[PDB]
Design a protein around this ligand. Structure first.
Ligand SMILES: CCN(CC)C(=O)c1ccc([C@H](c2cccc(O)c2)N2C[C@@H](C)N(Cc3ccccc3)C[C@@H]2C)cc1
Ligand SMILES: CCN(CC)C(=O)c1ccc([C@H](c2cccc(O)c2)N2C[C@@H](C)N(Cc3ccccc3)C[C@@H]2C)cc1
Lengths: 397, 355
C-alpha cells in the first residue's frame, strides 16, 4: 500500500536525524539497522507519481536503483558503527542525506497538510460557537422571558437542550483530531462518547415529534386543542430523554480508552465478536436515527398536503388555507435539511465499514470532517432557526 | 405586520384575476403602513393604483426599496476568533516552552502573535454588538475594547513591517546583519513598537465613549470640535501610516532583496545556501500580497462610508462590511509568517506524501 511506503519513508528520515542525536555506537548502529530495513521495503513499493508506470519501466527501475545506492551506503556506515567509530559513521550519514535527494526525492514529494487542519478547526469552532451559544441563548429566553406555557416552547427547549449537549463535545473531538491522541481519559471518554450518541437520538426524535405535533396542529385543529397541552408536551419530551438512555447507557458502558501504537484511543469495546455488534449498532443507528425519522416526517408532510387539498377542494377560506400552507412548506424544509445533513455521514459510516478507503488521504479527511460537521449543523441550527423565526419567541427578544 | 407582508408577496405572484390580486395587495399595504417605512407603502399603493387602471414589476422593486446572514457573520467571527486566539496563544507558548526566543525572528513572531491574540480577544464583544445592535458592556469596556482594537492594529502592522525590514538586512546586508539582528536589539525594536503605538492607544482610549444614539447604546469615538475634521484627519492618518506606509516599506524591501538575489545568483555561484535566501524573498511577496488583499477592502470601505451615503441597513452592504472587517482580523491573527512558523515547528505532523 501507499501507507506502508509513507510509513517506511518516514522511519528512514526519522532514523536519519537519530544518527545526529546519537552520542555512542549503540544508538548509531540501531538507527542504521532500522534505516536499512525501511529502504529495502520502500524499494519494493510504488511511488504515487509512478502508480501508473510498469513495475519494469525505466522510472520504476531508477526508483529502486536509488535505494540500492542508499542500502550500500548504510552497509558502509554500519561497519564503522561495528568498529566503534562514531566520527566516521556519523559523517557517512551526510552521504546518505544527499543520496535520498539525488535519486529517490524525484518520486517521493510531500506537502504540508496544515492548511487543512486549520480549515477543519475553523469549521468545528464556528459550528461549536454558533450551536452551543445559540442553543443556550434559546434555552435561557425560554426560561427567563417566554416561560414555556405553550407545547412548542417545550419542544424547542428539548431540541435546544439536545443541540447544546451535541456541540459541547466538539472541543474534545476537535482536540483529538489535532493531537491524534485522547488526553482527557476514560471518565471524559465515557462522558463524551455517551453524550454524542444520546444527544443524537434525543435531537432527532424531538425534531420528529415536533413534526407530528405540527401535523396534529394543522390537520386536526379541533382535536389539537386537547392534545397540544403543555403538560402533554412535557410527558412526550420526558419519554424521549428517558427512552434514548437505551443508547446512552450502552455506549457509556462500552466507551473505553485503550493504547494503539503508543497513542491513546477513545473507542467502543463491543462484546465478542466486536465486528458483528459493531455492524448491528451501525445497521440500527441507520434505521432508527435516519430511516424511521424520515418516514414519519414525510408521512406527516404527505397527510398535511393531502388534508390541505381537502380544505382547498371545498374552496372556503383563502387566508386560513394559505397560512397553514406555510407550515406544510416548512415541514418539507425540515425533511430536505435533515436528509442533506445526515445522508453524507450515514453513507460514510456504511462505505467505511465495507470499502477500505485510505484514512490518511487529505481529500478523504476533508470530506469526512465536512460530513461530521453537517450532522452537528442540523441538530444545533434546527432549534436556533425555529426559535428566531417563531413570532412569539421573536417578541421576548 | 408579518401576515400583511406575506399577503403582499402572495398575491404578487398571482384581467379578472389581475384586478382581484391588486385590490387585495392595496388593502394589505394600507394595513401594513398602519417615516421612511410608512413612505414606502405610499409609493407601493400609488403604483398599485396605476397597475389597477391597466407594469407588474415596478411593485416588486419598490417593496425591496436577515437571520441567515446574522448566522453566517457569527460563524465567520467565531471561526476567526477561535483560529486566531487559540492559534496565536499556541505560537506564543511554543516560543516560550520550546524555541526559547534565542533568535531575533522568534522575538518578532512573539510580538506579532501577542498583537494577534489581543486583536481577536475583542471579537466576542464586537460580535455581540452586531447581534443585539446595542453596547451593553458599558463605557469602561467600551474604552478597553476600542483602544485594544486600534492599538493591536498598529502594533501588529508595525511588528510585521519591521520583521520585513529585519529580513531585508539579513539578506541584503549579511556582514552588517551580524551586529544588528541581535536578540537584545530585536527586543528593543519590539518594545519601541508597543511603546510607540500607545500614541494611538491612549488617544482612542481617551475619546472612546458610550452614548445613546437611535434609542439604543453606541460605543464610539468623541472627536474634539470640529468632530467631522478630526474624524477625517484620523481616517487619512490610519490609511496612510497603517496601509500606504507599511506597504511601501515591505515592497521596497522586496524590490531591493530581489536585486541582491540577482547578484548572488552569479557572483556567489553554485550553492544551497543561495536558494535559501530566495525562499525569504518569496516569503516577503506572500506577506505584502496577503497584507493588501486583507487590508485594502476595509480601508476602501471606511473611505466610501465617509463620502457615499450607503444604506447601513441593506443586507448586501452588511455582508460586504463584516467580510471586510473579518479579512483585516484574518491578516493579523492568521498571518502568513504565523502560518510558516507553525509549518516549520510542526512539520513532521502535517507533512504527508502527495497521494
Ligand atoms: C473512522 C471515521 N468515522 C467513520 C465514518 C468516524 O469517525 C465516525 C464515527 C462515529 C460517527 C457517528 C455516527 C454517525 C452515523 C452513523 C453511525 O453509526 C455513527 N456520529 C458521531 C458524530 C458525527 N455525531 C454528531 C452529532 C450530531 C447531532 C447530534 C449529536 C451528535 C453523530 C454520531 C454519533 C460518525 C463518524
Ligand atoms: C460604520 C461602519 N464602519 C465603517 C466602514 C465600521 O464599522 C468600521 C469602524 C472602524 C474600523 C477600523 C478601521 C479600519 C480601517 C480604517 C479606519 O479608519 C478604521 N478597524 C476596526 C477593526 C476592523 N479593526 C480590526 C483589527 C485587525 C487587526 C488587528 C487589530 C484590529 C481594525 C480597525 C481599528 C473599520 C470599520
Amino acid at each position: 500500500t501507499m501507507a506502508d511506503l509513507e510509513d517506511n519513508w518516514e522511519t528512514l528520515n526519522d532514523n536519519l536525524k537519530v544518527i545526529e542525536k546519537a552520542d555512542n555506537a549503540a544508538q548509531v548502529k540501531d538507527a542504521l539497522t532500522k534505516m536499512r530495513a525501511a529502504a529495502l521495503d520502500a524499494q519494493k513499493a510504488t511511488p504515487p507519481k509512478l502508480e501508473d508506470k510498469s513495475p519494469d519501466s525505466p522510472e520504476m527501475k531508477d526508483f529502486r536503483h536509488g535505494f540500492d545506492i542508499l542500502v550500500g551506503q548504510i552497509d558502509d556506515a554500519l561497519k564503522l558503527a561495528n568498529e566503534g567509530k562514531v566520527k566516521e559513521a556519523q559523517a557517512a550519514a551526510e552521504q546518505l542525506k544527499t543520496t535520498r535527494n539525488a535519486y529517490i526525492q524525484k518520486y517521493l514529494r510531500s506537502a504540508s497538510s496544515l492548511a487543512l487542519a486549520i480549515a477543519i478547526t475553523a469549521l468545528y469552532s464556528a459550528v461549536c460557537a454558533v450551536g452551543l451559544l445559540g442553543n443556550v441563548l434559546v434555552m435561557f429566553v425560554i426560561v427567563r422571558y417566554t416561560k414555556m406555557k405553550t407545547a412548542t416552547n417545550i419542544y424547542i427547549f428539548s431540541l435546544a437542550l439536545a443541540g447544546a449537549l451535541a456541540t459541547s463535545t466538539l472541543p474534545f473531538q476537535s482536540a483529538d483530531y489535532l493531537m491524534e491522541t485522547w488526553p482527557f481519559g476514560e471518565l471524559l471518554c465515557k462522558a463524551v462518547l455517551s453524550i454524542d450518541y444520546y444527544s443524537m437520538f434525543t435531537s432527532i426524535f424531538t425534531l420528529t415529534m415536533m413534526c407530528v405535533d405540527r401535523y396534529i396542529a394543522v390537520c386536526h385543529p379541533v382535536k389539537a386543542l386537547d392534545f397540544r397541552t403543555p403538560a402533554k408536551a412535557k410527558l412526550i419530551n420526558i419519554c424521549i430523554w428517558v427512552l434514548a438512555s437505551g443508547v446512552g447507557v450502552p455506549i457509556m458502558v462500552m466507551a473505553v480508552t485503550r493504547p494503539r501504537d503508543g497513542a491513546v484511543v477513545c473507542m467502543l469495546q463491543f462484546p465478542s465478536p466486536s465486528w458483528y455488534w459493531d455492524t448491528v449498532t451501525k445497521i440500527c443507528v441507520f434505521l432508527f436515527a435516519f430511516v424511521v425519522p424520515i418516514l414519519i416526517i414525510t408521512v406527516c408532510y404527505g397527510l398535511m398536503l393531502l388534508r390541505l387539498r381537502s380544505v382547498r377542494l371545498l374552496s372556503g377560506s383563502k387566508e386560513k388555507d394559505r397560512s397553514l400552507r406555510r407550515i406544510t412548506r416548512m415541514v418539507l424544509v425540515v425533511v430536505v435539511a435533515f436528509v442533506v445533513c445526515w445522508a453524507p455521514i450515514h453513507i460514510f459510516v456504511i462505505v467505511w465499514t465495507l470499502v477500505d478507503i485510505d484514512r490518511r488521504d487529505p481529500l478523504v479527511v476533508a470530506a469526512l470532517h465536512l460530513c461530521i460537521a453537517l450532522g452537528y449543523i442540523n441538530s444545533s441550527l434546527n432549534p436556533v432557526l425555529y426559535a428566531f423565526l417563531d413570532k412569539n419567541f421573536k417578541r421576548c427578544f
